[PDB]
Write a protein that binds this ligand. Structure first.
Ligand SMILES: CCC[C@H](NCc1c(COP(=O)(O)O)cnc(C)c1O)C(=O)O
Ligand SMILES: CCC[C@H](NCc1c(COP(=O)(O)O)cnc(C)c1O)C(=O)O
Lengths: 297, 297
């Protein structure tokens, strides 16, 4: 067992895909990354919303001032080449990461050129498919006036780490974070939805959350299924009182939340319908959505 | 030209001191680092407050939940061995960095063991010794309720990057950041002092700043010199109206601020006295302080 990894145009062994410990990306949290799934349906391997993830990678890089010298098209091709070169025929999580490979102590990162690495890794479920127990954590989500939280920027994730570790140490599966204004915004690595009186609600972008591609997927799904949907701020009380709640994300997929700070919630019907639909979409069984699947072979 | 670098007990070439691009330290800003100077006085090479920096490295790691399997003593010896092994006889900036060397997508970083790398690099002045022009930037310093800013934690520095880049792009030498409550707290990589009516003032730790070892040095210096000193919050207006102001830091040393957002300040007498004293201290000419100098040879 040793898989290949794309790195600035070249396939190398995992063991050779390394960056100097003096990199300002390692020292100062200055890079961007992505999370992309590929699903095996029995007949092919499909990368889900590949192009969308690669355009977001570049939006992230533009947001933080990182120069990524590749286009979204190149990056997309790179993913396909990398999955091929390994001959995977199973569910993958794909990690592109863009970082500075030059050693540099100076915070002045102007004019640097990012490298990109892409790894593909066998991956099953991230959260219990039957539902997870969640805790609102003491750590607040980092705020837009301090760090650009809408970007999937590496240094921001120290915030997600504090959150994730705190919930897990206390026995739970996942953290929920509030923003600076006390609104429910995000799991450590998931966007969040609740259902209240048959309306689906998810915090708006302006609340300071990652603009998740799963989130966006679920918004279209709700459009198709005729489920009324509001992008509206959510408070802790609404979460405690929700008829249902669930997390969404590339790794997380669609996962029900069956407990929040000891308050029990049903594994609910809207969650279930959305989870079933999303599975059909990613496995290639919904014709309308095939433009979002990139065949590897 | 190729220098040696300490890495988990072993001296290796810079080119071999590399970490997998899948490291949660690279992907999620989860590590800690230090900044340590060594000064050449003509007769020896002295590392300044080595032990203090290494104990802070470990406080940082304890703060963010990173397990560093070395003691401050070991880390100190490592620095000396590394400077020796390179045979430097000149001014150095030393970068220890503690990070996770295992590849890992999961945010669950519990139970991991950090590696440490230590590099030493020739280094002269960071900011113009005659004084710098500074701008209060649009980016706020990250807040304690979101990230542990008192630690020298890698992912936090994306905040310092946004600040430093913004000031430099607009033509200035350095950024000043306000905290969430609007108080002047820190440069992108410096603590800040002002002098108002002959009293030296620097923001208190609780304002959300790095507990700088230079800052601490200057507080003792002021004690010795009989300069009244307050650890008190500073507002923008006080900075505009200061009789003098200056930045301090390992890299920065003691640097006057001669302009803030177009408002001119004198290169002042207290700044000068503190800069002259600090130089004498680090070059070994002040007997009282010799316990803070570690001879390399
Ligand atoms: C492992 C870190 C989590 C990681 N990010 C997913 C993620 C999301 C949802 O984003 P999307 O639906 O675009 O996947 C929301 N919020 C955060 C903090 C995330 O990490 C993931 O790649 O799934
Ligand atoms: C290159 C990043 C700046 C870096 N940190 C120094 C530094 C200080 C002052 O700390 P000390 O006096 O302990 O050095 C204050 N504040 C910040 C944000 C810093 O980066 C330095 O190593 O000097």
């Amino acid at each position: 067992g040793s898989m290949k990894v794309w790195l600035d145009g070249r396939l190398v062994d995992e063991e050779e895909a390394k960056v100097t410990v003096l990199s300002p990306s390692l020292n100062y949290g200055f890079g961007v990354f992505e999370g992309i799934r590929a699903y095996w349906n029995g007949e092919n391997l499909y990368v889900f919303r590949l192009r969308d993830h690669m355009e977001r990678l570049l939006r992230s890089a533009k947001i933080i001032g990182l120069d990524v010298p590749y286009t979204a098209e190149e990056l997309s091709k790179a993913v396909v080449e990398t999955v091929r070169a390994n001959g995977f025929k199973e569910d993958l999580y794909i990690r592109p990461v863009a970082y500075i490979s030059k050693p540099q102590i100076s915070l002045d990162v102007r004019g640097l050129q990012a490298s990109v690495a892409i790894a593909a890794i066998p991956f099953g479920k991230y959260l219990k498919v039957e539902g997870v127990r969640a805790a609102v954590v003491s750590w607040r989500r980092v705020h837009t006036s301090m760090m650009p939280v809408m970007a999937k920027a590496t240094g921001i994730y120290l915030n997600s780490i504090m959150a994730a570790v705190e919930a897990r140490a206390r026995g739970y599966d996942e953290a929920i974070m509030l923003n600076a204004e006390g609104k429910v915004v995000e799991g450590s690595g998931e966007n969040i939805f609740i259902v209240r009186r048959g309306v689906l609600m998810t915090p708006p972008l302006e609340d300071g959350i990652l603009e998740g591609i799963t989130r966006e997927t679920v918004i279209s799904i709700a459009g198709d299924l005729g489920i009324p949907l509001l992008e509206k701020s959510i408070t802790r009380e609404e979460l405690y009182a929700a008829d249902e709640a669930f997390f969404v994300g590339t790794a997380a997929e669609i996962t029900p939340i069956i407990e929040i700070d000891g308050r029990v919630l049903q594994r609910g019907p809207i969650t279930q319908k959305i989870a079933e639909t999303y599975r059909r979409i990613v496995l290639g069984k919904e014709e309308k959505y095939l433009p979002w699947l990139t065949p590897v072979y």
